Amino acid sequence: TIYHAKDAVQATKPDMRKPRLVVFVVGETARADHVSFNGYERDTFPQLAKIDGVTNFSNVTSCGTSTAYSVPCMFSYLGADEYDVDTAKYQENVLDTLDRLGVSILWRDNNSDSKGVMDKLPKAQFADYKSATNNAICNTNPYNECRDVGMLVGLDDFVAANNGKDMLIMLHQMGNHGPAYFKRYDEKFAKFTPVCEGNELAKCEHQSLINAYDNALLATDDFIAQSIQWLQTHSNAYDVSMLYVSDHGESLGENGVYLHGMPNAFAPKEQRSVPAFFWTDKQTGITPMATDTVLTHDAITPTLLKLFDVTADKVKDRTAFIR
Numbered sequence: 612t613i614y615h616a617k618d619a620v621q622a623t624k625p626d627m628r629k630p631r632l633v634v635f636v637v638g639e640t641a642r643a644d645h646v647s648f649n650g651y652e653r654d655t656f657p658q659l660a661k662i663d664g665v666t667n668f669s670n671v672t673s674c675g676t677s678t679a680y681s682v683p684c685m686f687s688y689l690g691a692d693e694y695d696v697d698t699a700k701y702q703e704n705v706l707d708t709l710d711r712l713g714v715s716i717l718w719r720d721n722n723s724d725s726k727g728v729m730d731k732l733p734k735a736q737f738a739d740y741k742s743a744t745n746n747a748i749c750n751t752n753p754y755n756e757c758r759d760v761g762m763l764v765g766l767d768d769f770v771a772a773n774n775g776k777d778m779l780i781m782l783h784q785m786g787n788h789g790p791a792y793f794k795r796y797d798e799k800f801a802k803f804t805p806v807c808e809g810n811e812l813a814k815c816e817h818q819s820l821i822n823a824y825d826n827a828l829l830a831t832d833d834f835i836a837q838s839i840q841w842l843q844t845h846s847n848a849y850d851v852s853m854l855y856v857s858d859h860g861e862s863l864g865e866n867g868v869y870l871h872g873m874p875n876a877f878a879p880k881e882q883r884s885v886p887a888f889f890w891t892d893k894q895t896g897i898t899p900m901a902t903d904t905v906l907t908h909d910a911i912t913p914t915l916l917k918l919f920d921v922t923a924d925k926v927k928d929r930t931a932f933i934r
């Protein structure tokens with residue numbers, strides 16, 4: 612392990628102020644420009660729009676264009692300019708630091724896995740929610756595909772067993788993962804029709820592809836709202852906050868390009884322009900940065916440290932999502 616924050620200290624402890632409870636949704640394949648709040652022509656986030664205290668960040672660039680590359684960078688101390696995907700797994704990352712400091716770290720995954728982020732931590736702190744041995748919400752669709760909202764079930768049991776501690780829960784979404792966007796949402800989210808249902812994107816009518824993509828955003832809108840609603844049920848005992856950032860965007864036929872993973876050197880902007888939301892309870896004292904702050908995945912690690920009142924030299928001056 613190569614360390615970067617051995618100096619990290621927590622200024623205030625959960626035995627002398629309210630314990631802090633944060634959900635970080637790690638999104639999947641969502642594009643900034645298909646978000647209602649960023650000026651998209653469709654209301655793709657109706658439920659989040661009903662919730663007070665949500666900040667939408669209109670200028671966020673992902674570290675990369677793929678799950679393997681972006682997800683470790685999101686939790687890195689190095690920043691996009693110095694990040695090396697090939698050695699990322701051996702670097703101390705922001706979750707190693709918080710866990711060392713006594714924050715209870717939980718990773719639930721309905722996507723793939725943590726791409727090495729949870730590897731130095733006890734396996735008991737990672738849970739696979741792609742399988743029904745954990746996820747109670749899979750038989751709601753003709754594919755029996757397990758749903759992101761299933762990662763919320765039983766979180767009260769996790770809180771109860773971590774009584775009075777700081778807690779950071781990562782929820783790694785299936786989200787808008789392609790090519791089969793149509794599979795990614797239940798029927799209640801099939802607002803935009805007709806929809807593409809083949810693995811040959813490009814052979815699909817372009818509008819029908821967009822329609823399946825947008826329906827999957829409505830399922831994500833629903834999941835993020837439910838996440839905040841779950842947090843609100845603990846807001847008296849805990850200072851609760853919710854951070855959402857997508858790992859990367861998606862090409863939807865622009866210049867003949869589909870899916871993602873284009874190398875950064877020639878990747879279209881659609882693959883790196885991602886949405887980000889921050890919600891917090893009024894009690895927490897946490898203040899969002901300006902909506903239009905130029906932001907990147909580099910802001911995640913300082914944001915997670917500030918949420919728990921932790922300082923570390925390597926990111927002392929680094930712009931975050933919050934003050």
Ligand SMILES: [Au+]
Binds near residue numbers: 678
């Ligand atoms: Au991804």
